[PDB]
């Protein structure tokens, strides 16, 4: 899909979560234990800007764009 392994790791987790509130940054850290905070943030920022994910009504959680 053009995304890097890191970007896909983050996107796949967000996609795989059907909960209405989505995943927060702590959830990402907890599930991507081999990825640094900076690397996760880098991937999230990219996915957000590209439009693959968005921040929910709650200012700190992430969901996949349908």
UniProtKB/Swiss-Prot annotation:
Residues 1-66 are annotated as: Interaction with RAD52, TIPIN, UNG and XPA. Changing residue 51 to A: Does not affect interaction with RFWD3. It comes from the Eukaryota. It is found in: Nucleus; Nucleus, PML body. Induction: Translationally up-regulated in response to DNA damage (at protein level). Differentially phosphorylated throughout the cell cycle, becoming phosphorylated at the G1-S transition and dephosphorylated in late mitosis. Dephosphorylation may require the serine/threonine-protein phosphatase 4. Component of the replication protein A complex (RPA/RP-A), a heterotrimeric complex composed of RPA1, RPA2 and RPA3. Interacts with PRPF19; the PRP19-CDC5L complex is recruited to the sites of DNA repair where it ubiquitinates the replication protein A complex (RPA). Interacts with SERTAD3. Interacts with TIPIN. Interacts with TIMELESS. Interacts with PPP4R2; the interaction is direct, DNA damage-dependent and mediates the recruitment of the PP4 catalytic subunit PPP4C. Interacts (hyperphosphorylated) with RAD51. As part of the heterotrimeric replication protein A complex (RPA/RP-A), binds and stabilizes single-stranded DNA intermediates that form during DNA replication or upon DNA stress. It prevents their reannealing and in parallel, recruits and activates different proteins and complexes involved in DNA metabolism. Thereby, it plays an essential role both in DNA replication and the cellular response to DNA damage. In the cellular response to DNA damage, the RPA complex controls DNA repair and DNA damage checkpoint activation. Belongs to the replication factor A protein 2 family. This is Replication protein A 32 kDa subunit. It comes from Homo sapiens (Human). The lineage of its organism: Eukaryota, Metazoa, Chordata, Craniata, Vertebrata. The gene is RPA2.
């Amino acid at each position: 899909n053009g995304l890097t392994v890191a970007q896909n790791q983050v996107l796949n987790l967000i996609k795989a979560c059907p909960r209405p509130e989505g995943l927060n940054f702590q959830d990402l850290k907890n599930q991507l234990k081999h990825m640094s905070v900076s690397s996760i943030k880098q991937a999230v920022d990219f996915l957000s800007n590209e439009g693959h994910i968005y921040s929910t009504v709650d200012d700190d959680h992430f969901k996949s764009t349908d």
